[PDB]
Design an enzyme around this catalytic site. Structure first.
Site, PDB file in Angstrom:
ATOM      1  N   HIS A  14      -3.408   4.689  -0.897  1.00 48.15           N
ATOM      2  CA  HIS A  14      -4.759   5.962  -0.814  1.00 48.15           C
ATOM      3  C   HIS A  14      -5.645   5.319  -0.654  1.00 48.15           C
ATOM      4  O   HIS A  14      -6.161   6.526  -0.226  1.00 48.15           O
ATOM      5  CB  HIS A  14      -5.093   5.284  -2.539  1.00 48.15           C
ATOM      6  CG  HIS A  14      -4.141   6.655  -3.875  1.00 48.15           C
ATOM      7  ND1 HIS A  14      -4.112   7.606  -4.009  1.00 48.15           N
ATOM      8  CD2 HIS A  14      -3.403   5.863  -4.592  1.00 48.15           C
ATOM      9  CE1 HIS A  14      -3.283   7.791  -5.056  1.00 48.15           C
ATOM     10  NE2 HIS A  14      -3.080   6.700  -5.380  1.00 48.15           N
ATOM     11  N   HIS A  53       0.542   0.325  -3.653  1.00 47.58           N
ATOM     12  CA  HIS A  53       0.039   2.165  -3.680  1.00 47.58           C
ATOM     13  C   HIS A  53      -1.218   2.209  -3.647  1.00 47.58           C
ATOM     14  O   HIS A  53      -1.208   3.235  -3.092  1.00 47.58           O
ATOM     15  CB  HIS A  53       1.292   1.968  -4.946  1.00 47.58           C
ATOM     16  CG  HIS A  53       0.273   3.417  -5.563  1.00 47.58           C
ATOM     17  ND1 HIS A  53       1.636   4.486  -6.442  1.00 47.58           N
ATOM     18  CD2 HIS A  53      -0.543   4.052  -6.385  1.00 47.58           C
ATOM     19  CE1 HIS A  53       0.759   5.791  -6.716  1.00 47.58           C
ATOM     20  NE2 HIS A  53      -0.745   5.080  -6.536  1.00 47.58           N
ATOM     21  N   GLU A  54      -1.841   1.458  -3.835  1.00 47.58           N
ATOM     22  CA  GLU A  54      -3.408   1.975  -4.219  1.00 47.58           C
ATOM     23  C   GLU A  54      -3.989   2.174  -2.295  1.00 47.58           C
ATOM     24  O   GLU A  54      -4.767   2.067  -1.944  1.00 47.58           O
ATOM     25  CB  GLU A  54      -3.853   0.661  -4.734  1.00 47.58           C
ATOM     26  CG  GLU A  54      -3.752   0.617  -5.789  1.00 47.58           C
ATOM     27  CD  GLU A  54      -3.964   1.764  -6.930  1.00 47.58           C
ATOM     28  OE1 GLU A  54      -4.882   2.266  -6.571  1.00 47.58           O
ATOM     29  OE2 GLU A  54      -2.826   2.133  -8.044  1.00 47.58           O
ATOM     30  N   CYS A  88       2.295   8.541 -10.536  1.00 46.23           N
ATOM     31  CA  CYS A  88       0.677   7.654  -9.732  1.00 46.23           C
ATOM     32  C   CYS A  88      -0.323   8.898 -10.623  1.00 46.23           C
ATOM     33  O   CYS A  88       0.337   9.917 -10.704  1.00 46.23           O
ATOM     34  CB  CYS A  88       0.611   8.576  -8.277  1.00 46.23           C
ATOM     35  SG  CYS A  88      -1.384   8.457  -7.840  1.00 46.23           S
TER      36      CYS A  88
HETATM   37  C1  LIG Z   1       3.917   0.605  -9.588  1.00 43.47           C
HETATM   38  C2  LIG Z   1       2.819   1.363  -8.850  1.00 43.47           C
HETATM   39  C3  LIG Z   1       1.412   1.140  -9.008  1.00 43.47           C
HETATM   40  C4  LIG Z   1       0.651   2.587  -9.671  1.00 43.47           C
HETATM   41  C5  LIG Z   1      -0.217   2.450  -9.638  1.00 43.47           C
HETATM   42  C6  LIG Z   1      -0.541   4.208 -11.102  1.00 43.47           C
HETATM   43  C7  LIG Z   1      -1.927   3.703 -11.398  1.00 43.47           C
HETATM   44  C8  LIG Z   1      -2.604   5.007  -9.477  1.00 43.47           C
HETATM   45  O1  LIG Z   1      -2.128   6.174  -9.229  1.00 43.47           O
HETATM   46  N1  LIG Z   1      -3.099   4.512  -8.900  1.00 43.47           N
HETATM   47  O2  LIG Z   1      -3.345   4.654  -7.528  1.00 43.47           O
HETATM   48  C9  LIG Z   1       0.012   3.794 -11.762  1.00 43.47           C
HETATM   49  O3  LIG Z   1      -0.808   2.618 -12.953  1.00 43.47           O
HETATM   50  N2  LIG Z   1       1.268   4.533 -12.719  1.00 43.47           N
HETATM   51  C10 LIG Z   1       1.838   4.043 -14.039  1.00 43.47           C
HETATM   52  C11 LIG Z   1       2.995   3.486 -13.205  1.00 43.47           C
HETATM   53  O4  LIG Z   1       3.839   4.511 -12.077  1.00 43.47           O
HETATM   54  N3  LIG Z   1       3.718   2.498 -13.663  1.00 43.47           N
HETATM   55  C12 LIG Z   1       3.204   1.755 -14.990  1.00 43.47           C
HETATM   56  C13 LIG Z   1       4.304   0.544 -15.349  1.00 43.47           C
HETATM   57  C14 LIG Z   1       5.097   0.070 -14.884  1.00 43.47           C
HETATM   58  C15 LIG Z   1       5.029   2.037 -13.424  1.00 43.47           C
HETATM   59  C16 LIG Z   1       6.639   2.816 -13.824  1.00 43.47           C
HETATM   60  O5  LIG Z   1       7.430   2.601 -13.377  1.00 43.47           O
HETATM   61  C17 LIG Z   1       2.184   5.273 -14.626  1.00 43.47           C
HETATM   62  C18 LIG Z   1       0.304   5.706 -14.846  1.00 43.47           C
HETATM   63  C19 LIG Z   1       2.871   6.468 -13.828  1.00 43.47           C
HETATM   64 ZN   LIG Z   2      -1.412   6.573  -7.109  1.00 44.40          ZN
END
Ligand SMILES: CCCCC[C@H](CC(=O)NO)C(=O)N[C@H](C(=O)N1CCC[C@H]1CO)C(C)C
Ligand SMILES: [Zn+2]
Ligand SMILES: [Zn+2]
Ligand SMILES: [Zn+2]
Ligand SMILES: [Zn+2]
Length: 181
Positions: free
Chosen positions: A137, A133-134, A91
């Protein structure tokens, strides 16, 4: 702009319905997408940029000129699948922290687009995952609230480092603590 990080209380605060669908909304959506691309995310919610409003954006490709730039305003979940699946989440409000979260595989959704038109949509696979996830939030729910006790234990010290950072920056005790749980 600044991504709001745990344990900032903005991430737990009530998020207000959006009634006005105008140019200011379009500008904010653009800024949020641009934050997402800059920080290598695949979604973002308004409280994470300091605005307590019911707005999320995402792109399941996570890359420029790929996927779809999905905008959802005032979303409500209407159904979750019985089927559950694990997936490693991070996140942007918790830099560097990744852990397994189990969530429903799919969801049926009611929301409004950027123009304010209402729609129903079924989501599955990665888009469903990002969505939930969103959505959490927007309900003031953070991803560690969804982790098992075993998985939570593995990230406790990382969470406390974030609590310390907030304590050091503000001079205040953290308003929440992972250990309380
Ligand atoms: C999977 C649930 C959605 C996660 C959304 C988050 C962004 C966030 O905090 N939204 O509130 C993100 O991009 N997270 C990434 C993430 O979790 N990812 C990016 C590719 C797939 C997954 C890792 O398995 C990274 C920045 C940590
Ligand atoms: Zn998040
Ligand atoms: Zn800034
Ligand atoms: Zn832009
Ligand atoms: Zn990348």
């Amino acid at each position: 702009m600044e991504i709001v990080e745990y344990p900032d209380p903005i991430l737990r605060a009530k998020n207000k319905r959006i009634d006005i669908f105008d140019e200011n909304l379009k500008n904010l959506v653009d800024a949020m997408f641009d934050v997402m691309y800059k920080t290598d995310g695949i979604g973002l919610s308004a409280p994470q940029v300091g605005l307590n409003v019911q707005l999320m954006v995402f792109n399941p490709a996570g890359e420029p000129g790929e996927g779809k730039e999905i905008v959802l305003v005032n979303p409500k979940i209407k159904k979750y699948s019985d089927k559950l699946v694990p997936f490693d989440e991070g996140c942007l409000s918790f830099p560097g922290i990744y852990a397994e979260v189990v969530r429903p595989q799919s969801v049926k959704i009611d929301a409004r687009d950027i123009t304010g038109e209402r729609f129903s949509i079924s989501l599955s696979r990665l888009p469903a995952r990002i969505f939930q996830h969103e959505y959490d939030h927007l309900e003031g729910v953070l991803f560690f609230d969804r982790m098992t006790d075993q998985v939570l234990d593995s990230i406790r010290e990382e969470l406390e480092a974030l609590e310390k950072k907030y304590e050091e920056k503000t001079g205040l005790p953290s308003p929440e603590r992972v250990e309380a749980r």
